[PDB]
Structure 1
């Protein structure tokens, strides 16, 4: 049978996205497809299971769904292991977002706007946790080592952040068969929409590192199409306004990076600029418009509170479904339980490409292996690839990324990854200190010590404290 395991299946909406895509993929929607849903939170796990079962039943799909609280049971003999888990200390918290919000506030207390985990070229909220992302890294490495023993054919499809750091560390330190997943590339379709271009007529390519990807090829009707972006900047950018806090692809920040680097940053890359765009909320609003993006002291707490209410509502929905088994979720909440339209994410196409040779182009975090020849072979990049039964085949990246992207953006971001991995494996607080010694917001060494101390002393960081002690 085909065993697909979701680790952190209490991530309700994502679990439902995965299930619905599987149930709507002919080659996978079979009685021999077993979806294992695993999580450490009983209530969230049960809600995802109840909704996933009902959803499948309404889609007339014969896939079997299994819930389990045993990580080993989920890993054993799996063919694909999707890691979307976000660890937390259950004595203090109910989910992982809380530890990042609280550490961030301590960082701000000590003079680090948006927390010590916000750094140049890595502003994406919750991407790293206390620089080295100990609990997230630790879980990924634990899964990889169990996978090599109990499931040596499986793919570990890492979606929990930091995707770059984790995919790199697992590859390098375990050799387990990990691939990192992020669909930030989808930003390109808004570029095409704003320039009035049929995406099917655009010859495009993107490449870089996770949340550090660039539109390296953008061609239309046998010519460079970037001059069309030049026109849009001249004639449309003054009137641009974001539709919501996440809407940054065509923002002044993205175009300012385009003007300097020569290629347009794509997706979350636009959030990950230098400090020029992020010194404070006023600066963020100048460069991202009225919300100041999503990575600020107003919008991010607002969003994390929305997620909490959504978590509770879906759980309530699960209870409601038990009491009223006659209701059709596809009808009452079609947005959450759609039929006839795949989500568009890459996870289930990846599985269907590996297992059923349904060949597709995806953007995946895999070892460079010479694709960007100026970088080491073993560094994990986010690359355009074709996936089939024979594995993952990297496209040629042409044009190459510009010289400025290499020396000003990709290499600094790659070194930060190496810093963060060194901080994890050395168990050495001096390495965390050195990272903050390279941080523009540091004013003194005593400040670094004090901010780390207070973070380490937070009750829910007992394990972290002992690890670095």
Structure 2
């Protein structure tokens, strides 16, 4: 008997998650999927749509409580968004007036998002740990930072951080070369939204050169960049390496949050009567990453998945306990890190810097300290100068006063 808990069932991505679950239900047994959400009305619409898609292939349940969802669960998926789109709007917009990048996961936006998430994830990991001891698969942002927090501070081992960029990238290369997903093997490492690809293999063949060539054929890295750095770079690195250009673009356009308010409102209307997943829905591929991971956690085949976990030797010149986004051998409930060699100095300058920042943030959270928050904020590469840091922090703390208090 096998049950999957979904926390944040009201999410507009839920339907693609269920499609993934339906696709794997032929290979592994799923008796029930149970949904929990703080917003009951929004989840009911979604879950009614889900019921119509499942057609009784497994049971679809709603729990009124988080504990009721997770108590008999073998897997718990975190899909919730602390503070909601209103929080994300604050995250993106507040840093702008200081001349800083405002973005959901990167920089000061990621910092306030993290402060909102930590108390909720703390409460949730404790409950899971006192009951089912499930494996937790996390999408909640910021995903890598939360993983660092849970793995090295709460010390819950079966917490796996996921993101959609690895799977989107493998998908790209597969269609480029007309091969299957698992035919693609990468040298890949970094932090969630801060990742680097060094080698690309397809069916065993080294096609790195061909990937670089194809990337060529003005918000995008120019050609000379790839020739210089020789890494395929996470698109999110644009906020670092093209800061002035990104700032100008964010600050002269509607906040991204506000725009997804409109998209979400539209999808919910469609969900009332929809018989199949609406095109306007189709980070959509997060879903396939979750379901394939659960699938390969369930069997004894042994498969490669890029996930957020402790380095443990994946990258030889980084400390073992850094949570990284890296390729692992996944089999029967365990995740094994795979040897990759040395990481490039360019990549490591980013990885170290934000690893230090994100640990300063965690410490500041754990001690509920304004002083240490300032120290965390000054350390982020896209953080404030000294002259703006106090005002910025106060603004962040006031906006997040329902979620966290620092003294």
TM-score range, shorter chain: 0.7 to 0.9
Does the 8 Å CA contact 1:257/1:264 hold for their aligned counterparts?
no
Within the alignment, does 1:401 sit opposite 2:343 as a pair? yes
Task: Mark the structure with the bigger radius of gyration.
Answer: 1
Does the 8 Å CA contact 1:7/1:84 hold for their aligned counterparts?
yes
Does the 8 Å CA contact 1:29/1:62 hold for their aligned counterparts?
no
Does the 8 Å CA contact 1:123/1:273 hold for their aligned counterparts?
no
Q: Secondary structure at the match of 1:329?
A: coil
Structure 1 residues 203 and 137, CA gap change in structure 2 (3 angstroms): closer
Does the 8 Å CA contact 2:80/2:140 hold for their aligned counterparts?
yes
Look up the match of 2:236: 271
Q: Write out per-residue CA displacement over residues 321-345 of structure 1, whole angstroms, 9 at most, x where no aligned residue.
A: 4xxxxxx703xx554799xxx9872
Look up the match of 1:45: 43
Greater alpha carbon shift after TM alignment, 374-383 vs 36-45 = 374-383
Does the 8 Å CA contact 1:21/1:343 hold for their aligned counterparts?
no
Normalised to the residue count of structure 2, the TM-score between the two structures is 0.86
Q: Secondary structure at the match of 1:357?
A: coil
Q: Cα RMSD between the aligned structures?
A: 3.2
Of 77, 101, 110, the residue aligned with 1:114 is: 101
Does the 8 Å CA contact 1:329/1:337 hold for their aligned counterparts?
no
Of 118, 121, 141, the residue aligned with 1:161 is: 141
Within the alignment, does 1:17 sit opposite 2:16 as a pair? yes
1:450 and 1:334 map into 2 onto residues whose CA distance is: 44
Look up the match of 1:428: 369
1:41 Cα deviation after fit: 0.3
Q: Secondary structure at the match of 1:346?
A: helix
Q: Secondary structure at the match of 2:140?
A: coil
1:44 and 1:335 map into 2 onto residues whose CA distance is: 20
2:258 and 2:403 map into 1 onto residues whose CA distance is: 26
Within the alignment, does 1:308 sit opposite 2:251 as a pair? no
2:299 and 2:383 map into 1 onto residues whose CA distance is: 52
1:15 and 1:65 map into 2 onto residues whose CA distance is: 12
1:174 Cα deviation after fit: 2.4
Does the 8 Å CA contact 1:124/1:272 hold for their aligned counterparts?
no
Structure 1 residues 184 and 337, CA gap change in structure 2 (3 angstroms): closer
Count of aligned pairs between the two proteins = 401
Normalised to the residue count of structure 1, the TM-score between the two structures is 0.75
Of 159, 162, 172, the residue aligned with 1:178 is: 159
1:124 Cα deviation after fit: 7.5
Q: Secondary structure at the match of 2:237?
A: coil
1:273 Cα deviation after fit: 4.2
Structure 1 residues 69 and 256, CA gap change in structure 2 (3 angstroms): farther
Does the 8 Å CA contact 1:100/1:129 hold for their aligned counterparts?
no
